[PDB]
Coordinates of N, CA, C and O in Angstrom, one line a residue:
Chain A
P1 N -62.6 -50.6 49.7 CA -63.0 -50.7 51.2 C -64.5 -50.3 51.4 O -65.2 -49.7 50.6
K2 N -65.1 -50.9 52.5 CA -66.5 -50.6 52.8 C -66.8 -49.2 53.3 O -65.8 -48.6 53.9
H3 N -68.0 -48.8 53.0 CA -68.4 -47.3 53.5 C -67.9 -46.2 52.7 O -67.7 -45.1 53.1
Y4 N -67.4 -46.6 51.4 CA -66.8 -45.5 50.5 C -67.6 -45.2 49.3 O -67.1 -44.7 48.3
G5 N -68.8 -45.8 49.3 CA -69.7 -45.7 48.0 C -69.2 -46.9 47.1 O -68.9 -47.9 47.5
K6 N -69.2 -46.6 45.7 CA -69.1 -47.5 44.7 C -68.0 -47.1 43.7 O -67.8 -47.9 42.8
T7 N -67.4 -46.0 43.9 CA -66.3 -45.6 43.0 C -64.9 -45.5 43.6 O -64.8 -45.1 44.7
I8 N -64.0 -45.7 42.7 CA -62.6 -45.5 43.1 C -62.1 -44.5 42.1 O -62.3 -44.4 41.0
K9 N -61.2 -43.4 42.7 CA -60.6 -42.4 41.9 C -59.1 -42.4 42.0 O -58.7 -42.9 43.0
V10 N -58.4 -41.8 41.0 CA -57.0 -41.6 41.1 C -56.5 -40.5 40.1 O -57.2 -40.3 39.2
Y11 N -55.4 -39.9 40.6 CA -54.9 -38.8 39.6 C -53.9 -39.3 38.7 O -53.2 -40.2 39.0
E12 N -53.8 -38.6 37.6 CA -52.8 -38.7 36.7 C -52.2 -37.4 36.3 O -52.8 -36.5 36.1
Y13 N -50.8 -37.3 36.4 CA -50.1 -36.0 36.2 C -49.5 -35.9 34.8 O -48.7 -36.8 34.6
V14 N -49.9 -35.0 34.1 CA -49.5 -34.9 32.7 C -48.2 -34.3 32.7 O -47.8 -33.5 33.4
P15 N -47.2 -34.8 31.7 CA -45.9 -34.1 31.7 C -46.0 -32.6 31.1 O -47.0 -32.3 30.5
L16 N -45.0 -31.9 31.4 CA -44.9 -30.4 30.9 C -45.1 -30.5 29.4 O -46.0 -29.7 28.9
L17 N -44.2 -31.2 28.7 CA -44.2 -31.2 27.2 C -45.2 -32.2 26.8 O -44.9 -33.3 26.6
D18 N -46.5 -31.7 26.6 CA -47.6 -32.6 26.2 C -48.7 -31.8 25.6 O -49.2 -30.9 26.3
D19 N -49.3 -32.3 24.6 CA -50.5 -31.6 24.0 C -51.6 -31.8 24.9 O -52.6 -31.0 24.8
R20 N -51.5 -32.8 25.7 CA -52.6 -33.0 26.7 C -52.5 -32.0 27.9 O -53.4 -31.9 28.6
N21 N -51.4 -31.3 27.9 CA -51.2 -30.2 29.0 C -51.9 -28.8 28.6 O -51.1 -28.0 27.9
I22 N -53.1 -28.5 28.8 CA -53.8 -27.4 28.5 C -53.9 -26.5 29.6 O -54.7 -27.0 30.6
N23 N -53.4 -25.4 29.8 CA -53.4 -24.4 30.9 C -53.2 -23.0 30.5 O -52.8 -22.8 29.3
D24 N -53.5 -22.1 31.3 CA -53.4 -20.7 31.1 C -52.2 -20.0 31.7 O -52.3 -18.8 31.8
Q25 N -51.2 -20.8 32.1 CA -50.0 -20.1 32.7 C -49.0 -19.7 31.8 O -48.0 -19.1 32.2
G26 N -49.2 -19.8 30.5 CA -48.2 -19.7 29.4 C -47.7 -18.1 29.4 O -48.6 -17.3 29.1
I27 N -46.5 -17.9 29.5 CA -45.9 -16.6 29.1 C -44.7 -16.8 28.2 O -43.9 -17.8 28.7
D28 N -44.6 -16.2 27.0 CA -43.6 -16.6 26.0 C -42.3 -16.0 26.3 O -42.1 -15.3 27.4
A29 N -41.3 -16.1 25.4 CA -40.0 -15.5 25.7 C -39.9 -14.0 25.7 O -39.1 -13.4 26.2
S30 N -40.9 -13.4 25.0 CA -41.0 -12.0 25.0 C -41.8 -11.3 26.2 O -41.6 -10.1 26.3
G31 N -42.4 -12.1 27.0 CA -43.1 -11.6 28.1 C -44.5 -11.5 28.0 O -45.2 -10.9 28.9
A32 N -45.1 -11.9 26.8 CA -46.5 -11.8 26.5 C -47.4 -13.0 26.9 O -46.7 -14.2 26.8
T33 N -48.5 -12.8 27.3 CA -49.3 -13.9 27.5 C -49.8 -14.7 26.3 O -50.0 -14.1 25.3
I34 N -49.6 -16.0 26.4 CA -49.9 -16.9 25.2 C -51.0 -17.9 25.6 O -51.1 -18.3 26.8
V35 N -51.6 -18.5 24.6 CA -52.8 -19.5 24.8 C -52.3 -20.8 25.5 O -53.0 -21.4 26.2
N36 N -51.1 -21.3 25.1 CA -50.6 -22.6 25.5 C -49.5 -22.3 26.6 O -48.7 -21.5 26.4
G37 N -49.5 -23.2 27.6 CA -48.5 -23.1 28.6 C -47.6 -24.3 28.8 O -47.2 -24.7 29.9
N38 N -47.4 -25.1 27.6 CA -46.6 -26.3 27.5 C -45.4 -26.2 26.6 O -45.1 -27.3 26.0
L39 N -44.9 -25.0 26.3 CA -43.9 -24.9 25.3 C -44.3 -25.5 24.0 O -45.4 -25.1 23.4
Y40 N -43.6 -26.4 23.4 CA -44.0 -27.0 22.1 C -44.8 -28.4 22.3 O -45.0 -29.0 21.2
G41 N -45.0 -28.7 23.5 CA -45.9 -29.9 23.7 C -45.3 -31.2 23.1 O -44.0 -31.4 23.2
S42 N -46.2 -32.0 22.3 CA -45.7 -33.1 21.8 C -45.0 -33.0 20.4 O -44.8 -34.0 19.8
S43 N -44.7 -31.8 19.9 CA -44.3 -31.4 18.5 C -42.9 -32.1 18.4 O -42.1 -32.1 19.3
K44 N -42.7 -32.7 17.2 CA -41.3 -33.0 16.8 C -40.8 -32.2 15.6 O -39.8 -32.7 14.9
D45 N -41.5 -31.2 15.1 CA -41.1 -30.3 14.1 C -40.0 -29.3 14.5 O -40.2 -28.7 15.4
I46 N -38.9 -29.4 13.7 CA -37.7 -28.6 14.1 C -38.1 -27.1 13.9 O -37.9 -26.3 14.9
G47 N -38.9 -26.7 13.0 CA -39.3 -25.2 12.9 C -40.2 -24.9 14.0 O -40.1 -23.8 14.6
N48 N -41.2 -25.8 14.3 CA -42.0 -25.4 15.4 C -41.4 -25.4 16.7 O -41.7 -24.4 17.6
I49 N -40.5 -26.3 16.9 CA -39.7 -26.4 18.3 C -38.8 -25.1 18.4 O -38.9 -24.5 19.5
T50 N -38.3 -24.7 17.4 CA -37.2 -23.6 17.5 C -38.0 -22.3 17.7 O -37.4 -21.6 18.5
Chain B
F1 N 15.4 -40.7 6.8 CA 15.3 -39.2 6.5 C 16.4 -38.5 7.4 O 16.5 -38.8 8.6
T2 N 17.0 -37.5 6.8 CA 18.0 -36.6 7.4 C 17.3 -35.3 7.6 O 17.0 -34.6 6.6
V3 N 17.1 -34.8 8.8 CA 16.4 -33.5 9.1 C 17.4 -32.5 9.8 O 18.0 -32.9 10.7
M4 N 17.5 -31.3 9.1 CA 18.4 -30.3 9.5 C 17.5 -29.2 9.9 O 16.9 -28.7 8.9
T5 N 17.6 -28.7 11.1 CA 17.0 -27.4 11.5 C 17.9 -26.4 12.1 O 18.7 -26.9 12.9
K6 N 17.7 -25.3 11.8 CA 18.5 -24.1 12.2 C 17.5 -23.0 12.6 O 16.9 -22.4 11.7
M7 N 17.4 -22.7 13.9 CA 16.5 -21.6 14.4 C 17.1 -20.3 14.3 O 18.4 -20.1 14.1
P8 N 16.4 -19.3 14.0 CA 17.0 -17.9 14.0 C 17.6 -17.4 15.2 O 17.2 -18.0 16.3
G9 N 18.6 -16.6 15.1 CA 19.4 -16.2 16.3 C 20.8 -16.1 15.9 O 21.2 -15.7 14.7
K10 N 21.7 -16.4 16.8 CA 23.2 -16.4 16.5 C 23.6 -17.7 15.6 O 24.6 -17.8 15.0
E11 N 22.7 -18.7 15.6 CA 22.9 -19.9 14.9 C 23.0 -19.5 13.3 O 23.9 -20.0 12.6
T12 N 22.1 -18.7 12.9 CA 22.0 -18.4 11.5 C 22.5 -17.0 11.1 O 22.4 -16.5 10.0
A13 N 23.1 -16.3 12.0 CA 23.7 -14.9 11.8 C 24.9 -15.0 11.2 O 26.0 -15.5 11.5
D14 N 25.0 -14.6 9.9 CA 26.2 -14.8 9.0 C 26.5 -13.4 8.2 O 25.8 -12.4 8.5
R15 N 27.5 -13.3 7.3 CA 27.7 -12.2 6.7 C 26.6 -11.7 5.8 O 26.7 -10.5 5.5
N16 N 25.7 -12.5 5.3 CA 24.6 -12.1 4.5 C 23.4 -11.7 5.3 O 22.4 -11.2 4.7
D17 N 23.4 -11.9 6.6 CA 22.4 -11.5 7.5 C 23.0 -11.3 8.9 O 22.9 -12.3 9.7
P18 N 23.5 -10.1 9.3 CA 24.1 -10.0 10.6 C 23.1 -10.2 11.8 O 23.5 -10.5 12.9
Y19 N 21.8 -10.0 11.5 CA 20.8 -10.1 12.6 C 20.3 -11.5 12.9 O 19.6 -11.6 13.9
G20 N 20.5 -12.3 11.9 CA 20.1 -13.7 12.1 C 18.5 -13.8 12.4 O 18.1 -14.4 13.3
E21 N 17.8 -13.2 11.4 CA 16.3 -13.1 11.5 C 15.6 -14.2 10.9 O 14.4 -14.3 11.0
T22 N 16.2 -15.2 10.3 CA 15.5 -16.4 9.6 C 16.1 -17.7 9.9 O 17.3 -17.8 10.2
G23 N 15.3 -18.6 9.7 CA 15.8 -20.1 10.0 C 15.2 -20.9 8.9 O 14.5 -20.5 8.0
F24 N 15.4 -22.3 8.9 CA 14.9 -23.2 8.0 C 14.8 -24.6 8.6 O 15.4 -24.8 9.7
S25 N 14.2 -25.4 7.9 CA 14.2 -26.9 8.2 C 14.1 -27.7 6.9 O 13.2 -27.5 6.1
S26 N 15.0 -28.6 6.6 CA 15.0 -29.4 5.5 C 15.0 -30.9 5.8 O 15.4 -31.3 6.8
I27 N 14.6 -31.7 4.8 CA 14.5 -33.2 4.9 C 14.9 -33.7 3.6 O 14.5 -33.2 2.6
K28 N 15.9 -34.9 3.6 CA 16.3 -35.4 2.4 C 16.5 -36.9 2.6 O 16.6 -37.3 3.8
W29 N 16.6 -37.6 1.6 CA 16.7 -39.0 1.7 C 17.2 -39.6 0.2 O 17.2 -38.9 -0.7
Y30 N 17.5 -40.9 0.3 CA 17.8 -41.6 -1.0 C 16.8 -42.7 -1.0 O 16.5 -43.3 -0.1
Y31 N 16.5 -43.0 -2.3 CA 15.5 -44.2 -2.6 C 15.8 -44.8 -3.9 O 16.2 -44.2 -4.8
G32 N 15.6 -46.2 -4.0 CA 15.6 -46.8 -5.2 C 15.2 -48.3 -4.9 O 15.1 -48.8 -3.8
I33 N 14.7 -48.9 -6.1 CA 14.4 -50.4 -6.0 C 15.1 -51.1 -7.2 O 15.4 -50.5 -8.1
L34 N 15.1 -52.4 -7.0 CA 15.7 -53.3 -8.0 C 14.6 -54.4 -8.3 O 14.3 -55.1 -7.3
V35 N 14.1 -54.4 -9.5 CA 13.0 -55.2 -9.8 C 13.6 -56.5 -10.3 O 14.3 -56.6 -11.3
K36 N 13.4 -57.6 -9.5 CA 14.1 -58.8 -9.7 C 13.2 -59.8 -10.7 O 13.7 -60.2 -11.7
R37 N 11.9 -59.8 -10.5 CA 11.1 -60.6 -11.2 C 9.8 -59.9 -11.6 O 8.8 -59.9 -11.0
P38 N 9.9 -59.1 -12.7 CA 8.9 -58.2 -13.1 C 7.6 -59.0 -13.4 O 6.4 -58.5 -13.2
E39 N 7.7 -60.2 -13.9 CA 6.5 -61.0 -14.2 C 5.6 -61.4 -12.9 O 4.4 -61.6 -13.2
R40 N 6.1 -61.2 -11.8 CA 5.4 -61.5 -10.7 C 4.6 -60.3 -10.1 O 3.9 -60.3 -9.1
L41 N 4.7 -59.3 -10.8 CA 3.9 -57.9 -10.6 C 2.8 -57.9 -11.5 O 3.0 -57.8 -12.8
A42 N 1.6 -58.1 -11.2 CA 0.5 -58.1 -12.1 C -0.5 -56.9 -11.9 O -0.7 -56.3 -10.8
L43 N -1.1 -56.4 -13.0 CA -1.8 -55.2 -13.0 C -2.9 -55.3 -13.9 O -2.8 -55.8 -15.1
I44 N -4.2 -54.9 -13.5 CA -5.3 -54.8 -14.3 C -5.7 -53.3 -14.4 O -5.7 -52.6 -13.3
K45 N -6.0 -52.8 -15.5 CA -6.4 -51.4 -15.8 C -7.9 -51.4 -16.2 O -8.2 -52.1 -17.2
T46 N -8.6 -50.5 -15.5 CA -10.0 -50.5 -15.8 C -10.5 -49.1 -15.4 O -9.8 -48.2 -14.7
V47 N -11.6 -48.8 -15.9 CA -12.3 -47.5 -15.5 C -13.1 -47.8 -14.2 O -13.2 -48.9 -13.7
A48 N -13.4 -46.7 -13.4 CA -14.1 -46.7 -12.1 C -15.4 -46.0 -12.1 O -15.5 -44.9 -12.9
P49 N -16.4 -46.3 -11.4 CA -17.6 -45.5 -11.4 C -17.5 -44.3 -10.6 O -16.7 -44.1 -9.7
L50 N -18.3 -43.3 -11.0 CA -18.4 -42.1 -10.3 C -18.9 -42.1 -8.9 O -19.5 -43.1 -8.4
Chain C
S1 N 5.6 -35.2 -12.1 CA 6.2 -34.0 -12.6 C 6.5 -33.0 -11.4 O 7.2 -32.0 -11.6
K2 N 6.1 -33.4 -10.1 CA 6.2 -32.6 -9.0 C 7.1 -33.2 -7.8 O 7.1 -32.7 -6.7
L3 N 7.7 -34.3 -8.1 CA 8.6 -34.9 -7.1 C 9.6 -33.9 -6.7 O 10.3 -33.3 -7.5
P4 N 10.0 -33.9 -5.4 CA 11.1 -33.2 -5.0 C 12.5 -33.7 -5.2 O 13.1 -34.4 -4.3
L5 N 13.1 -33.7 -6.3 CA 14.4 -34.2 -6.7 C 15.4 -33.3 -6.4 O 15.4 -32.2 -6.8
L6 N 16.5 -33.9 -5.6 CA 17.6 -33.2 -5.2 C 18.8 -33.6 -6.2 O 18.8 -34.6 -6.8
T7 N 19.8 -32.8 -6.1 CA 21.2 -33.1 -6.9 C 22.2 -33.0 -5.8 O 22.1 -32.7 -4.6
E8 N 23.4 -33.4 -6.4 CA 24.6 -33.5 -5.5 C 25.0 -32.1 -5.0 O 25.7 -32.0 -3.9
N9 N 24.5 -31.1 -5.6 CA 25.0 -29.7 -5.2 C 24.0 -29.0 -4.3 O 24.3 -27.8 -3.9
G10 N 23.1 -29.7 -3.8 CA 22.0 -28.9 -2.9 C 21.4 -27.8 -3.5 O 20.9 -27.9 -4.7
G11 N 21.5 -26.7 -2.9 CA 20.8 -25.5 -3.4 C 19.5 -25.3 -2.8 O 18.9 -26.3 -2.2
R12 N 18.9 -24.3 -3.0 CA 17.5 -23.9 -2.5 C 16.4 -24.3 -3.5 O 16.1 -23.3 -4.3
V13 N 16.1 -25.6 -3.5 CA 15.1 -26.0 -4.3 C 14.1 -26.8 -3.5 O 14.3 -27.2 -2.4
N14 N 12.8 -26.9 -4.0 CA 11.8 -27.8 -3.3 C 11.4 -27.1 -2.0 O 11.6 -27.7 -0.9
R15 N 11.0 -25.9 -2.1 CA 10.4 -25.1 -0.8 C 8.9 -25.3 -0.7 O 8.3 -25.2 -1.8
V16 N 8.4 -25.4 0.4 CA 7.0 -25.6 0.7 C 6.5 -24.8 1.8 O 7.3 -24.2 2.6
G17 N 5.2 -24.7 2.0 CA 4.6 -23.9 2.9 C 3.4 -24.7 3.7 O 3.2 -25.8 3.3
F18 N 2.7 -23.9 4.6 CA 1.6 -24.6 5.3 C 0.6 -23.6 5.6 O 0.7 -22.3 5.5
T19 N -0.6 -24.1 5.9 CA -1.7 -23.2 6.4 C -2.5 -23.8 7.5 O -2.2 -25.0 7.8
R20 N -3.4 -23.0 8.1 CA -4.3 -23.5 9.1 C -5.6 -22.9 9.0 O -5.8 -22.0 8.3
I21 N -6.5 -23.5 9.7 CA -8.0 -23.1 9.6 C -8.4 -22.9 11.0 O -8.0 -23.3 12.0
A22 N -9.6 -21.9 11.1 CA -10.0 -21.6 12.4 C -11.5 -21.9 12.5 O -12.4 -21.7 11.6
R23 N -11.9 -22.7 13.5 CA -13.3 -23.2 13.7 C -13.8 -22.4 15.0 O -13.1 -21.8 15.8
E24 N -15.1 -22.3 15.2 CA -15.8 -21.5 16.2 C -17.1 -22.1 16.6 O -17.7 -22.8 15.9
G25 N -17.5 -21.7 17.9 CA -18.9 -21.9 18.3 C -19.3 -21.2 19.5 O -18.2 -20.6 20.1
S26 N -20.5 -21.1 19.8 CA -20.9 -20.1 20.9 C -22.0 -20.8 21.7 O -22.6 -21.8 21.4
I27 N -22.3 -20.1 22.9 CA -23.3 -20.7 23.7 C -24.5 -19.8 23.8 O -24.5 -18.6 23.4
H28 N -25.6 -20.3 24.5 CA -26.9 -19.6 24.5 C -27.5 -19.8 25.9 O -27.2 -20.8 26.5
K29 N -28.4 -19.1 26.2 CA -29.1 -19.1 27.5 C -30.5 -19.5 27.4 O -31.2 -19.1 26.5
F30 N -31.0 -20.3 28.4 CA -32.4 -20.9 28.3 C -33.0 -20.9 29.8 O -32.2 -20.8 30.8
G31 N -34.2 -21.0 29.9 CA -34.9 -21.1 31.2 C -36.4 -21.0 31.2 O -36.9 -20.2 30.3
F32 N -37.1 -21.5 32.1 CA -38.5 -21.3 32.3 C -38.8 -21.4 33.8 O -38.0 -22.1 34.6
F33 N -40.0 -21.1 34.3 CA -40.5 -21.1 35.6 C -41.9 -21.2 35.7 O -42.6 -21.2 34.8
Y34 N -42.4 -21.3 37.0 CA -43.8 -21.3 37.3 C -44.0 -20.9 38.7 O -43.1 -20.7 39.5
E35 N -45.3 -20.3 39.0 CA -45.6 -19.8 40.2 C -46.7 -20.6 40.9 O -47.4 -21.4 40.3
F36 N -46.9 -20.3 42.2 CA -48.0 -20.8 42.9 C -48.1 -20.1 44.3 O -47.2 -19.2 44.6
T37 N -49.2 -20.2 44.9 CA -49.6 -19.6 46.2 C -49.5 -20.7 47.4 O -49.4 -21.9 47.1
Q38 N -49.4 -20.2 48.6 CA -49.4 -21.0 49.7 C -50.6 -21.9 49.9 O -50.6 -23.2 50.1
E39 N -51.9 -21.3 49.6 CA -53.1 -22.1 49.6 C -53.1 -23.1 48.6 O -53.8 -24.1 48.9
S40 N -52.5 -22.9 47.4 CA -52.6 -23.9 46.3 C -51.8 -25.2 46.8 O -51.9 -26.2 46.3
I41 N -50.9 -25.0 47.8 CA -50.2 -26.2 48.4 C -50.9 -26.8 49.6 O -51.0 -28.0 49.7
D42 N -51.2 -26.0 50.7 CA -51.7 -26.3 51.8 C -53.1 -27.0 51.7 O -53.3 -28.0 52.4
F43 N -54.0 -26.4 51.1 CA -55.4 -26.9 50.9 C -55.6 -27.8 49.8 O -56.7 -28.5 49.8
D44 N -54.7 -28.1 48.9 CA -54.8 -29.1 47.9 C -54.8 -30.4 48.4 O -54.5 -30.9 49.4
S45 N -55.7 -31.2 47.7 CA -55.8 -32.6 48.2 C -54.6 -33.4 48.2 O -54.4 -34.2 49.3
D46 N -53.8 -33.2 47.3 CA -52.4 -34.0 47.1 C -51.4 -33.4 47.9 O -51.1 -32.2 47.6
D47 N -50.8 -34.0 48.9 CA -49.6 -33.4 49.5 C -48.3 -33.7 48.9 O -47.3 -33.2 49.4
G48 N -48.3 -34.3 47.7 CA -47.1 -34.5 47.0 C -47.1 -33.7 45.7 O -46.3 -34.0 44.7
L49 N -47.9 -32.6 45.7 CA -48.2 -31.8 44.5 C -46.8 -31.2 44.1 O -46.4 -31.2 42.9
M50 N -46.2 -30.5 45.0 CA -44.9 -29.7 44.7 C -43.8 -30.7 44.3 O -43.1 -30.4 43.3

């Protein structure tokens, strides 16, 4: 449309389980603050997932 | 097959067990064959892989 | 050598028994959550955030 400058923008919402989901909301099963807030993300390793 | 079942109780209470504390179940039959043309039965004997 | 052969006189021959096995399994508990404020909803650009 006219009178909106030269750029168009749009949002993309990342899924919860995604290595692309970097956030500081993570609290683990023990109640301690953790660096990642996406559980196991994109992992497919059984040991890591467990 | 002839199947005979006798449950514990007054059914099996006899002079050898006045209380009738045991029962049983039996199966019996007769079997036989008449081999008319033995040459029409063919058999290969061989070893088999593990 | 182990066929249950009977004779004309019967008697207590060829007695057999039975067994059973027990299987089991159990359940487990899971869950996760997230938090937000009213301002994070009302003043956010996207009205479909929640």
